[PDB]
């Protein structure tokens, strides 16, 4: 056999007990899905901004840039609905760490019961603040841990082509958006946007901890992720083409558009670039791009774990990304560029 | 939410329970996994060969298409090791019937419990009759209710990429093909060959049907198998690019060889074309090839589900098969050409 061991798994039911979406929290997610919902629908000019850490590894520096984002929120809250990245699922393209829920203290002790404990906490302490969270679900049996206090989710680009994680989308109660493949096919993505929106029968573990039959509705709120391929698929000539897919394929053309990974050539001060194009593109009159998608932590860079030295506070582990000040300018960008496109 | 209803599913002991696998269906599986791992290891000549429906939908032809194979196999040993296709899950581009599992009585009443029943127990029958099983290992809770049975294992062209699909594959006891990408990217099924060989830790469903954490030892008895792009992949060129990029990235350079899906342009008739330039590869000296995939049924081509029409005999209602007639002659090309790459 190849199954070394198999040890207990707090079930969904005692983490929900333990940590209760307070009135604060429940809103929060409540008022962010209708939102962004009402921004796919094309009734509400503004645009959805999924920014923050590649990874959350430290629930410190985590809440302390969640006070600072929501500051911005309500800045700009007339052109952006301003979305947290709470990402505490990380694919790899072989191996390596899986992020804070599979192995919280980054030392291969995998104490997941701890990462979902203090996963759930987080997630609550921010939406209680006010500020919605976004998040990679790509693992089958978190989301019943952790859905309840998610505004939107997102399918990343080596799982958009699975039908069990299209499955997953078409049950979740928040919009979800299909990244683009890592090779940068569109019509993965499209397809998925169209499996996703029919009901599905599929076997799923309920929040007893229970593997049961679930049939689900399909989900009408998905959307398309712009994150590159062998080369970037941000631009004008891009987005025309990928428009003109989605309408070939009966579906809404609109877009969202990731400034990391494969668009800045995974170069961190490349967001600022793509950034400055996409805001031409919406500032020039292009409705199309409903969201955005940046990452940003309180420090630009990245840092690595096998070094072994301490950690830098608030620094990425996984992904480089922008630090605090070019946020506060990106976010600044954006918005002008929606009041431009506005009119 | 969007989670229209939740049914109760019979845990995996229950169905072990009501279908125990006979010495003789338990022998089955442990010689072939064993075969195929002396031919990964280069101690067997042999070639691997996977053959079968499309998809499983009637127990009743599927028998009888295996007391056919079986004489094949037992006649074409020394140079053939024959694994039947027993598919009984099904990942679609966008939408349609998901295999025999997940609804047997196609006709979207989902009885998935009538569907593991069914399953297990043809599994069992094929298997106590001396002929073994592969399958595509889809689904992340339906592996324990039939692993026991399976002596080898498929990870499709769509969730190759896919991280909780490498981490199944780490934890099977039967060797696993991974698929390429379906635009063709060889390198996401060498990365997961790399992935799925190392120890992984995540959560999964017991045979008690319950959540909990799960360590894997790794798998080393998986291999590449090429199915087709937006060109076929089987001629020489580029098994010799696989042959290399394997090579390069530290793993013994084998394939297998899909004969249908990209690699026949969906045309079921082509696979006697691909059969024709493997066998003349194989036979001409190619020791890289290890293993081919055809899809052959009682009845060649297919039918489909929404005419409303009976539906005919040993015909897949998926994608098109050859006949038996054409399997037949397959076989013994396949047989010949070992026969004389040995010489
Ligand atoms: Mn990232
Ligand atoms: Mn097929």
Redo the contacts between chains.
């Keep these: 056999?190849?199954?070394?061991?198999?040890?207990?798994?707090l079930?969904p039911v005692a983490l929900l007990q333990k940590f209760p979406a307070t009135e604060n929290a429940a809103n929060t997610v409540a008022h962010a899905r209708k939102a962004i919902h009402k921004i796919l629908k094309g009734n509400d000019d503004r645009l959805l901004v999924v920014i923050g850490p590649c990874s959350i590894h430290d629930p410190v520096a985590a809440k302390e840039y969640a006070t600072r984002l929501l500051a911005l929120r309500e800045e700009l809250k007339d052109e952006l609905e301003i979305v947290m990245r709470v990402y505490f699922e990380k694919?790899?393209?072989?191996?390596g760490w899986?992020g804070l829920i599979?192995?919280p203290h980054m030392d291969?002790s995998?104490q997941?019961?701890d990462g979902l404990r203090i996963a759930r906490k987080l997630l609550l302490d921010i939406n209680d603040s006010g500020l919605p969270a976004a998040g990679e679900f790509?693992?089958?049996?978190?989301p019943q841990y952790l859905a309840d206090l998610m505004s939107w989710g997102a399918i990343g680009a080596?799982?958009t082509?699975?039908?069990?994680?299209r499955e997953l989308a078409?049950?979740?109660?928040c919009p979800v958006g299909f990244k683009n493949?890592?090779?940068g096919?569109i019509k993965?993505a499209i397809?998925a946007i169209?499996?996703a929106g029919?009901?599905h029968?599929?076997?799923?573990?309920?929040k007893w901890?229970?593997?049961?039959?679930?049939?689900?509705?399909?989900?009408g709120d998905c959307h398309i992720i712009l994150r590159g391929g062998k080369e970037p698929n941000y631009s004008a000539k891009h987005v025309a083409e990928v428009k003109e897919g989605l309408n070939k394929a009966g579906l809404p053309a609109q877009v969202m558009i990731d400034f990391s990974h494969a668009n800045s050539s995974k170069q961190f001060k490349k967001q600022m670039d793509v950034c400055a194009d996409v805001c031409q593109q919406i500032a020039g009159g292009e409705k199309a791009i409903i969201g955005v998608m940046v990452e940003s932590h309180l420090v630009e860079g990245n840092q690595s774990l096998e070094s072994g030295e301490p950690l830098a506070y608030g620094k990425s582990i996984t992904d480089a990304c922008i630090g605090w000040e070019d946020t506060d300018a990106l976010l600044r960008q954006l918005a002008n560029a929606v009041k431009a496109r506005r009119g």
């Design positions: 056999l190849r199954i070394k061991e198999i040890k207990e798994l079930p694919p790899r393209t072989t191996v899986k599979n192995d291969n995998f997941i019961n790509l693992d089958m049996i978190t080596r799982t082509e699975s039908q069990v994680h078409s049950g979740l109660s493949g890592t090779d096919t993965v397809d169209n499996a029919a009901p029968c599929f076997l799923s573990v309920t901890g229970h593997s049961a039959i679930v049939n689900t509705s399909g989900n």
